[PDB]
Amino acid sequence: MIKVEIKPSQAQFTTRSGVSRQGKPYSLNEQLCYVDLGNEYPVLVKMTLDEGQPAYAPGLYTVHLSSFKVGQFGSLMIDRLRLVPA
Amino acid sequence: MIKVEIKPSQAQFTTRSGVSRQGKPYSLNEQLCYVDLGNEYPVLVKMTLDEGQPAYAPGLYTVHLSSFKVGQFGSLMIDRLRLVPA
Known part of the structure; x- marks a missing residue:
């Protein structure tokens, strides 16, 4: 299991926007997290959230099978990295 | 944890070869496996092995953190999908 942490400072998402090749609008919500890859400290990772999903709250998480x-x-x-509570 | 299975029929690797952009020879060893992604049956996945590593033997495995x-x-x-015994 991959240990992922949302720190108190990472409790929000930002939104980027634009238009697809054939005219449809889109919005993408992005949130940051720390993933422990076994180095001396966890590394910073960007996540794009799925449609209609809120930002994950601060805490410990692991990776859901649907990520692959x-x-x-x-x-x-x-x-897309999809998380579930640890 | 991701469940990965090497079936008895997948106990070997095949090797592809060629030459890099600036002249160095390379060899890549490939092995197949089944990964359970929660659908009605496991799906077939190709793995490229690391240098000097033998084919994984038949059995059950999970994914090592160094894969990411x-x-x-x-x-x-x-x-690269890197495995450890379950």
């Missing part, structure tokens, strides 16, 4: 997919070359990839 | 890295856009990515 098989890519176009047949290897495993992260689609 | 922060990508060039600041989000988490899989570098």
Whole structure:
């Protein structure tokens, strides 16, 4: 299990916006977190949230299975980092 | 934890080869596995092994933390799927 932490200072999201190739508007919400990759300190990681989802509250989390997919070359990839409470 | 299975029929690797942009030879060893992504059956996934590593034997495995890295856009990515015995 991957340990992910939302610190008190990371409790909000920011929103970027634009227009798709054929005219549709979009909005993307982004939140930061710290992921422990076994180095001397956890590293800072950016997450794009799914539609209609609030920012995760401060606390400890692990990664949900729905974060993964098989890519176009047949290897495993992260689609979007999706979290569940630890 | 991600459940990964090497079936008896997946106990070998194949090798692809070539030459890098500035002349160095390379060899890449590839092995197949089944990863349970919570659908009705596990899905087939291709793995590229690290240098000097044998094919994983048949059995159950989970994913090692060293499989992950922060990508060039600041989000988490899989570098190479690296396994440890379950």
